[PDB]
Amino acid sequence: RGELGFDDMLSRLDSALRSESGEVLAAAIRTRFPVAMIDEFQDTDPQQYRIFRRIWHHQPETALLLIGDPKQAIYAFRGADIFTYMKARSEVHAHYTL
Amino acid sequence: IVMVADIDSYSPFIQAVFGSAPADRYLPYAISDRRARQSHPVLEAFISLLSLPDSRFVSEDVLALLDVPVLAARFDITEEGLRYLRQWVNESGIRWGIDDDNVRELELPATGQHTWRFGLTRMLLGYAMESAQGEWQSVLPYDESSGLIAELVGHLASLLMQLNIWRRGLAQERPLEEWLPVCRDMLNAFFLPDAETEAAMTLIEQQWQAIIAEGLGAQYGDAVPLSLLRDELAQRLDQERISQRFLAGPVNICTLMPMRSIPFKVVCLLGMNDGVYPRQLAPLGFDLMSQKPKRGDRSRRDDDRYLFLEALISAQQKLYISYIGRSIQDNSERFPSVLVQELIDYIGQSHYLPGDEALNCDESEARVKAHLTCLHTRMPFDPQNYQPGERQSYAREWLPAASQAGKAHSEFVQPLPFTLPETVPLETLQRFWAHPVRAFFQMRLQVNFRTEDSEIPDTEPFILEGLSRYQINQQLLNALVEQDDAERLFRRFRAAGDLPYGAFGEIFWETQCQEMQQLADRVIACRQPGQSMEIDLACNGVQITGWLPQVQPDGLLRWRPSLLSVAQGMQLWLEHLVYCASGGNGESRLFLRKDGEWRFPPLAAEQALHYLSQLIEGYREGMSAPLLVLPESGGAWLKTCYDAQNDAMLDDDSTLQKARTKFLQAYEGNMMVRGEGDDIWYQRLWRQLTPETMEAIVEQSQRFLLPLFRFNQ
Amino acid sequence: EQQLIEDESLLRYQACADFWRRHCYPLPREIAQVVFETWKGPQALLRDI
Amino acid sequence: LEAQEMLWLLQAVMTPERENTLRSALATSMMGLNALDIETLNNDEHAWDVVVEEFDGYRQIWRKRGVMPMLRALMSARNIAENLLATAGGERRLTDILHISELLQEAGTQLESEHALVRWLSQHILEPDSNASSQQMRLESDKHLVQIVTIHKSKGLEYPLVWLPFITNFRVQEQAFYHDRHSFEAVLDLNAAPESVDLAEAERLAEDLRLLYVALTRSVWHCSLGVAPLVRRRGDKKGDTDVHQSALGRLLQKGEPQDAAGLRTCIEALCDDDIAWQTAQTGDNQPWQVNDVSTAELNAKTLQRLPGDNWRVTSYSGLQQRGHGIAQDLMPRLDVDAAGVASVVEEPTLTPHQFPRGASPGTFLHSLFEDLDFTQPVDPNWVREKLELGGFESQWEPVLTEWITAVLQAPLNETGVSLSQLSARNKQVEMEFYLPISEPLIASQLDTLIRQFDPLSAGCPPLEFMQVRGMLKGFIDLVFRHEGRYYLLDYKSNWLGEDSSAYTQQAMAAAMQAHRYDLQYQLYTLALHRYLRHRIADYDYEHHFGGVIYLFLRGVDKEHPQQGIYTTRPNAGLIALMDEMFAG
Amino acid sequence: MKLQKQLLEAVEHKQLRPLDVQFALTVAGDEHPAVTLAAALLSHDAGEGHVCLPLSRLENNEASHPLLATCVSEIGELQNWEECLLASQAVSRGDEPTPMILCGDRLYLNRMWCNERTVARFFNEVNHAIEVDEALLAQTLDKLFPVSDEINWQKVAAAVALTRRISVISGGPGTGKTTTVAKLLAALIQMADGERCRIRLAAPTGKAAARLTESLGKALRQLPLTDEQKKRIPEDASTLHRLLGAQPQRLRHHAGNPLHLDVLVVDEASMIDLPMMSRLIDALPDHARVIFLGDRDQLASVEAGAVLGDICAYANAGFTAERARQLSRLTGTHVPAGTGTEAASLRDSLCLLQKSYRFGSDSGIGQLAAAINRGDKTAVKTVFQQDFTDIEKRLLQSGEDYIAMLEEALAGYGRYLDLLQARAEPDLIIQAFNEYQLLCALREGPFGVAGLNERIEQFMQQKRPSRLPEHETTWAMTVHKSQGSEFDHAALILPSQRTPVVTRELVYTAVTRARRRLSLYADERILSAAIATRTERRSGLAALFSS
DNA sequence: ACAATGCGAGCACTGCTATAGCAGTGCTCGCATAGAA
Ligand SMILES: [Ca+2]
């Protein structure tokens, strides 16, 4: 049909950063957005977080501001995986609270 | 001049509201800049036919082609006739692919059923040889199409053929030059040119030729797949814009066109919301030129922003600026296109109202922006729109409602004098009960909110449920009660396509046979083949007539493939009194599913006449006004309080409350089965059940439904 | 030039049923029945996956 | 319920002829009729037809302006909106009816038949829940209605006071879908392994608490929730109260299960200044004992202006009755002068009369002469190529290549003049003109003078258009000059009228008035007049004009002159009065 | 290919509709193209009303008949046509469930072949009403019929109808068919000792149904019958199409359902077609008695799809010896029996009535109508003779005399044309139109409807449910549509020279339309030719009665 | 011119066999069955 859905949208992006030609893409994006603020993060999913770190994780000259609240992650039924958050919680050591 | 970001998505509305009060209020308008595609039937229609070789041919889809005048006319199909075809297609079992090859081409199991060739065959096979006589070629004829009406079958059967000729003609790739006639041929094959359409059609042929000639010009060797051309024909058609009425019959509603900044006295901008106006689209990314800009360069961002400026510049007398402030759902707030923000911000920063001359920059500013900004209402009939001052609406139409000058709907039930005749076909008493309220609507004032267009199964039958399975249980039952051959039925049922596929169908049948047999056996076990009887009773000054079927010397024996219901007991109860009155002393049973039963003892011809009256009484009052009595809800509450011992009608607050449960439980059923209340007839009387009319329902339904329980078994 | 799909909720049922046709139709009774006792139709198979 | 009611209405509108469907329409709650009303209205035949007329008008309003305009027209009469609003829960019912209309309006501009819309409804009423575009619009008054929302829609939202009536429920997770506590992966045990279900059930309330957190978080000043010694286990109250299996219970009973009263004691445990409990004190008092007041002192501005004049830009379209609606829009140069179908006139010997009829082919012909080399001969390849691209059959080239020439070397009026004698420099193809027209052009006023000067327009049915101020568009197929004068040529592909006999100086002058082409003449020439006068600095009519040629392409042979072609020369005195007829 | 191209083109050239060509393709298509075409034509004729398709009209005769004798596939005369068809299994002798049956040398659409058999089964099962006791019957008969001195045929009609379950009464407009059914039932009521005798009247049309009662009530009121003269005919007007409830479509009746009655009397039977009958017959309680009424020679009894024509054919055979004697026993008159062939149950319950005795004549419309029902010489000298001036008016139509007709045509409608002019706008214009009416055999042409309407509307210049008027471009009506309708004045227009459409029964029904004046614009070649031709008759009903 | 399951209770009743407790067969009946680019 030549059509595209949303699950696909952020899925195809995850494959691209996975494939061999995943670096020219990682760097490309990385330049355009040297510092990114991810909001309502407590609701991400493996597909998301993957794309995210595959671009900004451990990268000088860039900043990844992950903000949200694990106590409010209630969208399990749509795929918000609280676990992938706790995973991300483990990888980044800089923690802050309001 | 009124300009909007997307003139296509504003057109419905523009037309809508400019459709107002002929005299006074009216002012002509002309929309320009719409797209050819998004504004012409046939266009998207043809583009559709260009997709045949990929289509699954789902039922609703093909029939959809018929709603296109020109296409229907081309096959001598009328709005009159469509209504039949539409029914037959559904009832004949059509829902899938055109051919069998069509199915295999989809790497699917050719079942040889439910496809069009099947449905059509069943129809033409019906044209002749009737439904009975058996299955022809594993196919069972469909008789609804037998009379002169069978002529329509020819027209439909003629279309699908054309569609198939082409669905297969357009299949393979051809050298550019060969595709040239294709567009013209098709249009003549599916469209009987109107007048308007003659125009639109010529446009199709233009682009088609264009797209092809162009490819030939650049000398393209290899062949071309249809998709290529269709997808392009689509795009072009999507960009071809119609705007011939731009400056004749006044008031121009359009979009912001670059390089067309004409001066107007009045300039209105609508939908200037953030994310909507400065129209976007990101450069290819591999458009070198966009990374290393130069003085000559151009981009939409720049074009649009300089457009907004050309407006302000071109507005000679009045500049009208409007945007949407909130979505009429989550009610969250939206924002004005930054451009509009940059305007009032400048206004406020360089102006001050007469009053406020000595207060503050920020403070004087606010009052200015706030003064020019006008927050409108959600509904047009909101009274604020009708007080005095800033834009009092010019639409008196709404005024009355704005002034709460309405007169609340008056209670629907108004007793209607009724003259009790003499001689009421037994049928009118049978059809009165088994739902009386309905009877007052359909009988007393010929009101039948008829409902038929009934959903066509978007698929073949994998499962049997509801109305269908019942209908199938009716024949299977009867066939087992007549100790006939169930094998015959089966084959017939299958040849019509009413059963799931093979192994699964064989299974379905087999298990229904098992439940129906259990039932039939209960009938056979005491079925004394009797015959018809005539009704001609004399009751409290009234007559009646009817044909009580299979009346046995035992009395009455009825059976049905459904669950027990109070409504059904009443049916047999009436069929009984009449029977007992007409003389004949005997009994009467109604065998249902799950071993249910409604059995009544022989009555003395005298008392039979005594109750045949009360039923006759209800029909009378029922004809004056809606006689309540909800056989199920009432039957429930009525069954929870009754007792076989001493004919004990309970009054204790223990069950008087369990009953009230059983009642509401029946009135408003589960999430699965669903309540007696859920019913148009009752719906028109009241949308919500009031504890008041509930009483009326009990008291009343107890007054007529009690004898049913005082005598069962 | 991608077109934003909307269906899916349907595209999905259709797919789940194409699966039921090419996979269950060709089945021989002994097997077919087993399947039947696991799920009655494609509709039931979807409500599970 | 409204959607259904509207549908019945559209069916009545779509056919007030059928006594039933109409009554049915009137019976709808939306019409606010009585039982009494229905009765009387059934026993009084004249008042019935009254209504029928009424609806027959609505269908008219529907056919002409659309559905929205029709429906609103209906409501305004039966004073629907005003009444409904005054009928408890009526406001909801109204907005929904209006809504439907807004959707019934879209759907309209996507189907060319009213019935097609009716159909459109049914389906939608049968298979709904599609987009969020057909979702219910909330009322602008609800900003004063206790709000009942879901923990989810409430995330982010703030509320003065909140209530959590069922915050104790839990519903145990049975589906063995869990995340591995070591690898943090979504695992699906297609086997109800107690171990993995145990894990999932854990993640369950792990989320319930997460919901609980959000629920309590929504209130600003206060929040009161409902607690109860809930029990799912069919285990006979063995000191059960599986309350501890709920997020809120788990926090009250600090993890361990409790006695029914054990809960009551845990609650008291923590409960001062900010926390406090009470027993579920039911109650009754049906009243929200609120009263009202109101003073509707309104009115709607009424404009004191009037329609008056209408500025439009017509174009010898004040003639041709519609059907060309959107046609002269999609194709500005479509052979609007032709239309129709063809049948068994195929006779096995192709001639210019059998050439495919209609607009699509007619414009193909016009096309050919858009850029042809009248001067030199007709190359067959160019012709073969012209048909090939045009979608026609190559086997038309002989007939066509011979047809074109025959028309070229055809003698126009008298001394010489023949398309083939015209070189580029003396040709101007497809001239588009704009003749301003001030002072209303009255159909009658023009019929008079058109009569006196033209013997053709003697067949006086005319004045078939109405007053028009503005402009006058117009395309001229061809304007050339035979070194002395300028001319007006209009190629006209028409007829299906069998053969030759229909293209005689009589037959032609007949179709002329038939299509009132005569007007085209006077108009067109009046334009060329204005143009030539404008360009040729100091020009005279009868010294520079002497033109007007109509070529009905078909019925034109190599040796049957005056057949197929028609010629006229405006009175010059007509053009005079006609010119000033514009600006007086 | 398959044959498709040839067929589909036949629709282009409108020589058989889509239903026909599609039906042939889906049922044959993959079989010898012959069977394919056969089904196409079968379904064709069927569309026109013909019940079956004669193998004859399909054996070398159609080389000058149906335009599809064009063929590359039609392998010679193929002769084995019977063989070639039966070969393909889209056709059978009747055994297997087949869309096409081959009984006799006739090819039917199953539905037809069954409908026919069901018809023949009905006229060869007609049991005798044991209700004999000729003694009484003869009495009740001698009393209702006085002038039985000279063989009274209406008295036998009854006698035959009272001693049979099924009976048909065929008679011209000038017979007491209306009143004969009156006494017929009058005695039926009478000889109904106790009770239980429900008589329900009917007709294919609401128009006849109308009359039945307003006449059966009139001639029934009168005469001796008060023994509770009210369990009369419910005067209740049923369309032959309600009793056996049809519903938008199957029927509530067939083999055990409605037909709550013991005695049925259908009128205008000559308008019942194969389809309707078939069901009515099974739907009739085995305990019911049907009395059909109509005119055997009416174009309606012979037009495609008719039956009354064929059913009444075996009348000319006379009664059987024993029946002829029994009837002559019931009536005080001897009853002939000219040649004992067979159809028994049929011949013995058929009965055509004739005009009775009255000095003078039945002249004009009368004489013409009779002779038209037979020989030339007769038809010839009644025209010339005495110039029945008023009644008959034969005028020579050929050449320029067509404009002669056009005159005395606007002349006829004189009354009508003047009410319009005199603006007398009430409903007398309606009754005025039924005073004069043109009748033609064709539907299109210089003659025929479409054609005659124009050439005439042009003269009133140069000078100046169904069938319900207000110019449906009527003015000139086809003898066909005019059925069941009668006008004071009537003129007939036949084609110049040709068409088999102009048969005897057509001319006959045309004449029987007039009450007073009858103009016949024809030629003593075409008229005398028509007089000899006799509307061809499809069917196997002729055979199914000869077993 | 037309109606969901399934699961255990819950209690009635029926063998055994170290009147009571444990078990098992059965039929009736109340109970709980989503979220919003
Ligand atoms: Ca032209």
DSSP D175-235: S-EEE-TTT--EEE-SS--HHHHHHHHHHHHHHHHHHHHHHHHTEEEEEEE-------S-S
- Report strand pairing: E100-103 vs E106-109: antiparallel
Give, rounded to a whole angstrom, the gap between the first and last alpha carbons of chain B: 82
Q: Which are the contacts of E437, defined by CB distance < 8 A and separation ≥ 6?
A: E477, E482, E487, E489, E490, E491, E513
Query: How far is residue E437's CA from residue E456's CA, in Å, rounded to a whole number?
Result: 13
Q: Specify the length of chain D in residues.
A: 584
- Residue E221, helix vs strand vs coil: helix
Query: How far is residue B371's CA from residue B367's CA, in Å, rounded to a whole number?
Result: 6
Dihedral angle at the C-alpha atoms of D499, D500, D502, D508, nearest 10 degrees? 140
To which residue do tokens 């329409």 refer?
D25
- Partners of B154 on chain E (C-beta within 8 Å) are 17-23
Q: Which residue is nearest to nucleotide F4 (CA to C1')?
A: B672
Nucleic acid strand F within 7 Å of D175 CB: no
Query: CA B521 – C1' F10 distance (Å)?
Result: 33
Query: How far is residue D520's CA from residue D542's CA, in Å, rounded to a whole number?
Result: 20
User: A83, D152: Cβ pair inside 8 Å?
Assistant: no
Nucleic acid strand F within 7 Å of A76 CB: yes
Which helix (DSSP H) or strand (DSSP E) does residue B86 occupy?
A: helix B79-92
E37 plus E78 within the same structural domain? yes
CB E274 within 8 A of CB E111: no
Helix locations, B582-690, DSSP H: 605-624, 633-641, 655-667, 680-685
Interchain CB contact of B130 with E (< 8 Å): yes
Domains in chain E: how many in total?
A: 3
Distance from CA of D208 to the nearest CA of A (A): 8
Q: Give residue B483's region: left, alpha or beta (phi > 0; psi -120 to 50).
A: left
To which residue do tokens 């007769």 refer?
E378
Q: Which are the contacts of B323, defined by CB distance < 8 A and separation ≥ 6?
A: B270, B271, B272, B273, B276, B334, B335, B336, B337, B340
Q: Can you say which residues of E are annotated as belonging to the binding site for ATP?
A: 171-178
Helix locations, B538-654, DSSP H: 566-581, 605-624, 633-641
> What's the CATH number where D72 sits?
1.10.486.10
Closest CA to B160 of B119, B110, B196, B109: B119
E162 plus E228 within the same structural domain? yes
Query: How far is residue E431's CA from residue A14's CA, in Å, rounded to a whole number?
Result: 88
Interface size between B and C, measured as CB pairs under 8 A: 41
Give the distance from CA B421 to its chain's centroid: 41
Query: How far is residue D518's CA from residue D527's CA, in Å, rounded to a whole number?
Result: 14
For B535, list phi and psi in degrees, rounded to 5. -110, 130
E314 belongs to a structural domain: yes
Give the distance from CA E227 to its chain's centroid: 37
To which residue do tokens 């919680």 refer?
A89
Best C5, C7, C9, C11 member to test A by mutation, with max A CBs in 10 Å, is C5
For D426, list phi and psi in degrees, rounded to 5. -105, 15
CATH 1.10.486.10-classified regions of chain B: 34-242
- Residue D164, helix vs strand vs coil: strand
Query: How far is residue E55's CA from residue E106's CA, in Å, rounded to a whole number?
Result: 6
Numbers of helices and strands, H then E, in chain C: 3, 1
Closest CA to B573 of B701, B700, B708: B708
Nearest chain D residue (CA) to B686: D29
Closest CA to E442 of E508, E520, E490, E501: E501
The total of other beta-carbon atoms located within 10 Å of residue B82's CB is: 20
Can you read off the two tokens belonging to residue E519?
A: 């103009």
What is the per-residue burial (b if ≥16 Cβ within 10 Å, else e) of A21-58? eeeebbeebbeeeeebebeebbbbbbbbbbbbbbbbee
Can you read off the two tokens belonging to residue D446?
A: 């023009």
Interchain CB contact of B129 with E (< 8 Å): yes
- Report strand pairing: B264-270 vs D549-551: unpaired
Distance from CA of C38 to the nearest CA of B (A): 13
E541 belongs to a structural domain: no
- Partners of B462 on chain C (C-beta within 8 Å) are 17, 20, 40-43
Instruction: Give me the sheet containing E166-170, strands edge to edge.
Output: E238-239, E199-203, E263-266, E289-294, E166-170, E350-352
Catalytic residue among D240, D335, D490, D518: D490
Query: How far is residue B701's CA from residue E24's CA, in Å, rounded to a whole number?
Result: 60
Which long-range contacts (C-beta less than 8 Å, at least 24 apart) are formed by B347-350?
A: B347/B372
User: E19, B154: Cβ pair inside 8 Å?
Assistant: yes
**Eight-state DSSP code of residue E168:** E
Interchain CB contact of B227 with C (< 8 Å): no
Q: Crossing angle, helix B226-239 and helix B196-217, to 10 degrees?
A: 120
Experimental method: X-ray
For residue B663, CA distances in Å to B564, B583, E422 come to 16, 37, 74
Helix locations, E401-532, DSSP H: 402-412, 414-421, 428-433, 449-457, 459-462, 504-511, 526-530
**Largest Cα–Cα distance of chain C, in whole Å?**
49
Q: What share of chain C is helix, strand, coil (3-state, %, to 5)?
A: 60, 5, 35
Tell me the nt nearest to B452, Cα to C1': F1
Give the distance from CA B582 to its chain's centroid: 48
Residue D433 is which amino acid? Answer: F
For D130, list phi and psi in degrees, rounded to 5. -50, -110
CB E264 within 8 A of CB E291: yes
Nucleic acid strand F within 7 Å of B470 CB: yes
Tell me the nt nearest to B564, Cα to C1': F3
CB D349 within 8 A of CB D365: no
Which residue in B111, B462, B504 is closest to C32 by CB distance?
Answer: B504
Best B8, B34, B194, B198 member to test D by mutation, with max D CBs in 10 Å, is B198
What is the per-residue burial (b if ≥16 Cβ within 10 Å, else e) of E187-222? bbbbbeeeeebebbbbbbbebbbebbbeebeebbee
Give, rounded to a whole angstrom, the gap between the first and last alpha carbons of chain D: 63
Residues 656-675 of B with CB under 7 A from strand F: 658, 670-674
Residues 588-627 of B with CB under 7 A from strand F: 593
**Eight-state DSSP code of residue B443:** I
- Give D461 Cα–ligand 1 centroid separation in angstroms: 23
Using only the alpha carbons of chain D, give its radius of gyration.
41
Residue E91 is which amino acid? Answer: V
CB B244 within 8 A of CB B28: no
Q: Where are the beta strands (DSSP E) in D20-143?
A: none
- Partners of A5 on chain C (C-beta within 8 Å) are 4-5, 8
Chains interfacing with A (3 or more CB pairs < 8 Å): C, D
**Eight-state DSSP code of residue E387:** G
To which residue do tokens 């869990």 refer?
D178
User: E26, B157: Cβ pair inside 8 Å?
Assistant: yes
User: D82, B406: Cβ pair inside 8 Å?
Assistant: yes
E268 belongs to a structural domain: yes
The total of other beta-carbon atoms located within 10 Å of residue E508's CB is: 24
E545 belongs to a structural domain: no
E27 plus E89 within the same structural domain? yes
Interchain CB contact of C10 with A (< 8 Å): no
For residue D32, the enclosing domain spans: 1-138
Query: How far is residue E20's CA from residue E27's CA, in Å, rounded to a whole number?
Result: 11
Query: How far is residue E417's CA from residue E464's CA, in Å, rounded to a whole number?
Result: 8
Query: Is it the case that chain B and chain E have 3 or more CB pairs lying under 8 Å apart?
Result: yes
For residue E462, the enclosing domain spans: 363-534
- Report strand pairing: D311-314 vs B587-591: unpaired
CATH 1.10.10.990-classified regions of chain B: 456-527
Query: How far is residue B102's CA from residue B107's CA, in Å, rounded to a whole number?
Result: 9
Out of E333, E353, E373, a domain closes at E353
Q: Please tell me the CATH superfamily of domain B34-242, with its number.
A: PCRA; domain 4 (1.10.486.10)
Q: Which are the contacts of E486, defined by CB distance < 8 A and separation ≥ 6?
A: E173, E434, E513, E514, E515
- Residue D548, helix vs strand vs coil: coil
Q: Specify the fold of B1-33+243-414.
A: Rossmann fold (3.40.50)
Chains interfacing with E (3 or more CB pairs < 8 Å): B
Residue E436 is which amino acid? Answer: Y
Q: Crossing angle, helix A46-56 and helix A6-16, to 10 degrees?
A: 40
- Residue B588, helix vs strand vs coil: strand
Can you read off the two tokens belonging to residue D339?
A: 């239309």
> What's the CATH number where E212 sits?
3.40.50.300
- Residue C11, helix vs strand vs coil: helix
- Residue E420, helix vs strand vs coil: helix
- Partners of A42 on chain D (C-beta within 8 Å) are none
E132 plus E250 within the same structural domain? yes
Q: Which are the contacts of D488, defined by CB distance < 8 A and separation ≥ 6?
A: D476, D478, D479, D521, D524, D525, D528, D547, D548, D549
E192 plus E70 within the same structural domain? no
Query: How far is residue E281's CA from residue E264's CA, in Å, rounded to a whole number?
Result: 11
Is D490 among the catalytic positions?
yes
Closest CA to D526 of D468, D584, D574: D574
Q: Which are the contacts of D91, defined by CB distance < 8 A and separation ≥ 6?
A: D84, D85, D139, D141
Query: CA D172 – C1' F21 distance (Å)?
Result: 34
- Partners of B235 on chain C (C-beta within 8 Å) are 1
CB B175 within 8 A of CB D319: no
User: E22, B136: Cβ pair inside 8 Å?
Assistant: no
CB E405 within 8 A of CB E521: yes
- Angle formed at CA D7 by CA D4 and CA D9, multiple of 5 degrees: 115
Which helix (DSSP H) or strand (DSSP E) does residue B691 occupy?
A: helix B691-711
Residue B587 is which amino acid? Answer: E
User: B108, C42: Cβ pair inside 8 Å?
Assistant: no
CB E297 within 8 A of CB E154: no
Can you read off the two tokens belonging to residue E138?
A: 């003869």
For A94, list phi and psi in degrees, rounded to 5. -75, 105
Query: How far is residue E446's CA from residue E450's CA, in Å, rounded to a whole number?
Result: 8
- Report strand pairing: E490-493 vs E518-522: parallel
Closest CA to B626 of B436, B383, B478: B436
Query: How far is residue B603's CA from residue B584's CA, in Å, rounded to a whole number?
Result: 10
Which residue in D106, D296, D393 is closest to B12 by CB distance?
Answer: D106
Query: How far is residue B269's CA from residue B271's CA, in Å, rounded to a whole number?
Result: 7
Give the class (CATH, top level) of B456-527: mainly alpha
> What's the CATH number where D475 sits?
3.90.320.10
Residue B61 is which amino acid? Answer: D
CB A91 within 8 A of CB A50: no
E133 belongs to a structural domain: yes
Residue A47 is which amino acid? Answer: Q
Q: Which are the contacts of D218, defined by CB distance < 8 A and separation ≥ 6?
A: D154, D157, D158, D159, D162
Q: Where are the beta strands (DSSP E) in B204-355?
A: 241-242, 252-255, 264-270, 315-321
Which helix (DSSP H) or strand (DSSP E) does residue D12 occupy?
A: helix D2-13
Q: Where are the beta strands (DSSP E) in D315-436?
A: 427-434
**Largest Cα–Cα distance of chain A, in whole Å?**
48
Query: How far is residue E401's CA from residue B514's CA, in Å, rounded to a whole number?
Result: 82
Which helix (DSSP H) or strand (DSSP E) does residue D82 occupy?
A: helix D80-85
Nearest chain B residue (CA) to E17: B154
E349 plus E448 within the same structural domain? no
Q: Where are the beta strands (DSSP E) in B459-596?
A: 531-535, 544-552, 555-559, 587-591
User: A76, D152: Cβ pair inside 8 Å?
Assistant: no
For residue B474, CA distances in Å to B369, B468, B559, D204, E293 come to 75, 10, 10, 48, 41
Closest CA to B339 of B367, B312, B374, B377: B312
E543 belongs to a structural domain: no
CB B370 within 8 A of CB B348: no
Which residue in B111, B459, B507 is closest to C25 by CB distance?
Answer: B111
Which long-range contacts (C-beta less than 8 Å, at least 24 apart) are formed by B524-527?
A: B524/B481, B524/B483, B526/B554, B526/B557, B527/B481, B527/B552, B527/B557
CB B613 within 8 A of CB B679: no
Nucleic acid strand F within 7 Å of B466 CB: yes
Which helix (DSSP H) or strand (DSSP E) does residue E491 occupy?
A: strand E490-493
Nucleic acid strand F within 7 Å of E49 CB: no
Q: Which are the contacts of B248, defined by CB distance < 8 A and separation ≥ 6?
A: B30, D311, D312, D313, D314, D470, D471
Please report how many Cα atoms fall inside a 13 Å half-sphere around the Cα of residue E135, on the Cβ side.
1
- Is residue D81 exposed (0-12), middle (13-18) or buried (19+ Cβ within 10 Å)? buried
User: Which bases of strand F sit closer than 7 A to a protein CB?
Assistant: 1-5, 8-10, 30, 32-37
CB E476 within 8 A of CB E452: yes
Query: How far is residue E304's CA from residue E323's CA, in Å, rounded to a whole number?
Result: 33
Q: Which are the contacts of B265, defined by CB distance < 8 A and separation ≥ 6?
A: B316, B317, B318
- Report strand pairing: D186-188 vs D177-179: antiparallel
Residue B191 is which amino acid? Answer: F
Closest CA to E493 of E356, E393, E344, E361: E393
User: B502, C36: Cβ pair inside 8 Å?
Assistant: no
- Give D299 Cα–ligand 1 centroid separation in angstroms: 56
Can you read off the two tokens belonging to residue D224?
A: 């009161």
Using only the alpha carbons of chain A, give its radius of gyration.
14
CB D33 within 8 A of CB D46: no
E402 plus E487 within the same structural domain? yes
Q: Which are the contacts of E312, defined by CB distance < 8 A and separation ≥ 6?
A: E168, E170, E296, E301, E350, E352
For residue E147, CA distances in Å to B370, C14, D238, E143, E154 come to 111, 84, 108, 10, 11
Query: CA B562 – C1' F14 distance (Å)?
Result: 36
Query: How far is residue B475's CA from residue B361's CA, in Å, rounded to a whole number?
Result: 88
CB E391 within 8 A of CB E518: yes
Using only the alpha carbons of chain E, give its radius of gyration.
25
Q: Can you say which residues of D are annotated as belonging to the binding site for Mg(2+)?
A: 366, 477, 490-491
